[PDB]
DNA sequence: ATCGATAGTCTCTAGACAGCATGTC
DNA sequence: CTAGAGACTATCGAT
């Protein structure tokens, strides 16, 4: 006994204490490669024996006393994969979470087994030096098909290179869905592989078509003729908890409202009405508070991280019968359920265009409740039009091949200005090289010195690299990379920042000029836009023409920045919705990038000598003007709070502890003690 | 010198990661 | 390309 049969036993030991309590993950062919010690790559249908799996593989891998660094695509999922890992901290297990959004403070993080973050967050914390990176020996990454994604892929390829590169002994086991050449990213990861399509709970996909729903179990078929409302009612009476899939958050918001009626008569929650209006009320989350009450729920990414939470949560304790959502849930959060509905096998993506059947076959994996349902249904909704293609291709079809996205200019530039800032590449031909163990080169046996000398002469240009004798960053580029910000975003505010300097609106907007920022749809109504642009025309960074064919993506950063200026002059939060047309999770979201982003711009603008955005990065991520950021760098005083006190004389700390009685009467006695409470600890 | 219906037309459309350092009403 | 709901408008007609 080394350490092999050790781990085994202590896997086995644990195992038993939640086989017990999640179900059991036959054929050892798989556990056996767990303990192998050699890169391997598990394609399985479902998450389910994925992540056990995986467990394993890092507590193997720490009684070993190695440090396994487990990557997801996605903030929520790095928590949820947290929150789970959070039961082998018994056998002395200390798990971590490092995302761009949340970190553990809970340990020393660089003393973890099992470090979960998100894959954009590991490559920075690379990028950022980080200590404890270099002592990971087991990686795991999750949804490795996201290898397929025109946003997410590249990063995925980027990281696990450059984290080989380093770690020679490295292991590295990606999870992956099922998909025809998932063997390739096996040999590409120089891999055992172990591709199943089990499932928990067996899966019969449908096609309801003219009041005909048809399922298919086996070999043979079952026709039977119904509505969709009662394809849920069916489901809901037997409270097994029906997802509907729809194409745009009206017709998920409709839908929701709808289907509320049928299920209003058989729950009433109006306890999660609450949880619900909580955080912010307004059209929507009435809306969305008055589906919750009657069973209903729709669920789309206009609702605010909490929103999110309370439905997700309430769906499982059954609470919630029905969940309308859009692409949203499709592959964040488990979320169980009998019955499943795409109501459309289309989407806006320049035009109405079909879903990948990967998405559709990845929406149907949801249904069926392992350990509830003796089977799991997927009806896909379709007219006479395209029957064929959905029981042919889609419900009968195998999901697309996993294609590599990394050959673009944007990506290449991105992600070479990092390979040469952390020293892996010091000349274009050692950037060739590393492009070489990418998951596009081994799909593509193409060279890209062409683009490679492109991209690296664009960021020459932009001062982020020099060539002095060989490939080397400047102040500007290590600056650059260490803020994971696209090289154009900082050209842009580096350029501007380094030839004016900006208002209000004028830095605002020039943080909409970007291509990291999100920007607002400007629409048939939003006229006033135009005019407001105008007037502040001499406060913008540049001005286009009205006949500019650009003038329309102009007008789009401009209504962006306005938002943000309303944001930042403590406009309500839902009169800044129903301006800007757009819903509570959507403000929170660019708000919370252009915070990001605001940041960056600071720190490229005092390189260069201006300062006239200081104090704007503070001020949109609160939400106040200037006068109050004293007051809400307090803990538990925000945008409202602080201006019901500044008003009132109190502005500071030190006012609010020289005068707690009046505080109280301002903001709450409740509040009042707990902001009190925490001034007195960091003073 | 009119409100009005029916039909052709226009508008609109999913999601969500990063810096930094800890908590809105 | 591989859409479909809902707001918008025009265009003809009966009074």
Not at 559 to 568: G, V
Request: charged share 30%; hydrophobic share 40%.
């Amino acid at each position: 006994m080394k350490v092999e049969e050790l781990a085994e036993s202590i896997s086995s030991y644990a195992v038993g204490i939640l086989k017990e309590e999640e179900l059991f993950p036959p054929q050892a062919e798989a556990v056996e490669k767990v303990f192998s010690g050699k890169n391997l790559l598990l394609a399985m249908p479902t998450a389910a024996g994925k992540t056990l799996l995986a467990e394993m593989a890092m507590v193997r891998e720490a009684i070993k006393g190695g440090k396994s660094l487990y990557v997801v695509p996605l903030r929520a999922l790095a928590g949820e994969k947290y929150e789970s890992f959070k039961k082998w901290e018994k056998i002395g297990l200390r798990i971590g979470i490092s995302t761009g959004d949340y970190e553990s403070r809970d340990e020393h993080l660089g003393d973890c087994d099992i470090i979960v973050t998100t894959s954009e967050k590991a490559d920075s914390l690379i990028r950022n030096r980080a200590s404890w990176i270099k002592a990971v020996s087991c990686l795991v990454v999750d949804e490795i098909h996201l290898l397929d994604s025109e946003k997410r892929g590249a990063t995925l390829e980027i990281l696990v290179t450059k984290m080989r590169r380093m770690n020679k002994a490295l292991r590295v086991i990606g999870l992956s869905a099922t998909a025809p050449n998932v063997t390739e990213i096996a040999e590409w990861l120089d891999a055992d592989y172990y591709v199943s399509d089990w499932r928990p709970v067996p899966l019969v996909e449908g096609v309801l078509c003219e009041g005909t729903l048809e399922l298919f179990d086996g070999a043979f078929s079952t026709s039977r003729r119904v509505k969709f409302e009662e394809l849920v009612e069916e489901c809901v009476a037997e409270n097994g908890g029906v997802l509907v899939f729809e194409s745009t958050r009206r017709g998920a918001e409709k839908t929701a409202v709808k289907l509320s009626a049928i299920t209003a008569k058989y729950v009433e929650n109006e306890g999660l009405e609450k949880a619900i209006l909580e955080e912010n009320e307004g059209e929507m989350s009435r809306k969305l508070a008055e589906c919750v009450r009657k069973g209903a729920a729709f669920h789309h990414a206009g609702l605010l991280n909490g929103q999110r939470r309370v439905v997700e949560d309430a769906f499982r304790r059954g609470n919630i019968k029905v969940v309308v959502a859009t692409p949203t849930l499709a592959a964040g959060v488990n979320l169980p359920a009998r019955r499943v509905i795409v109501r459309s096998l289309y989407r806006f993506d320049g035009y109405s265009k079909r879903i990948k059947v990967s998405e559709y076959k990845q929406m149907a994996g949801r249904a069926g409740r392992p350990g509830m349902d003796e089977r799991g249904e997927a009806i896909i909704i379709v007219g006479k039009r395209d029957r064929e293609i959905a029981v042919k291709r889609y419900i009968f079809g195998e999901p697309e091949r996993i294609t590599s996205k990394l050959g673009v200019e944007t990506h290449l530039r991105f992600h070479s200005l990092s390979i040469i800032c952390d020293g892996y590449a010091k000349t274009l031909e050692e950037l060739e090289d590393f492009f070489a163990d990418t998951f596009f080169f081994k799909q593509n046996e193409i060279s890209l010195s062409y683009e490679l000398e492109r991209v690296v002469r664009q960021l020459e240009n932009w001062g982020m690299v020099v060539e002095a004798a060989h490939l080397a960053p400047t102040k500007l580029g290590s600056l650059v990379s260490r803020l994971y910000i696209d090289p154009l975003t900082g050209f842009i505010f580096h350029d501007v920042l380094s030839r004016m300097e900006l208002s209000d609106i004028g830095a605002l907007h020039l943080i909409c000029r970007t291509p990291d920022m999100e920007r607002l749809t400007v629409r048939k109504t939003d006229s006033w836009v135009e005019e407001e642009a105008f007037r502040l025309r001499k406060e913008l960074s540049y001005y286009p023409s009205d006949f500019s064919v650009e003038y329309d993506w102009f007008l789009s950063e401009v209504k962006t920045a306005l938002c943000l200026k309303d944001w930042i002059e403590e406009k309500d939060e839902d009169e800044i919705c129903a301006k800007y047309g757009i819903a509570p999770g959507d403000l929170r979201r660019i708000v919370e990038t252009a915070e990001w982003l605001s940041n960056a711009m600071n720190r490229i603008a005092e390189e260069v000598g201006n300062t006239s955005v200081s104090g704007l990065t503070e001020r949109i991520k609160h939400g106040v003007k200037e006068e109050l950021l004293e007051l809400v760098r307090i803990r538990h005083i925000g945008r409202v709070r602080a201006r019901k006190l500044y008003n009132a004389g109190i502005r500071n700390a030190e006012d609010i502890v020289r005068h707690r009685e009046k505080v109280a009467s301002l903001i709450g006695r409740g509040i009042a003690e707990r902001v009190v409470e925490g001034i007195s600890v960091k003073s």
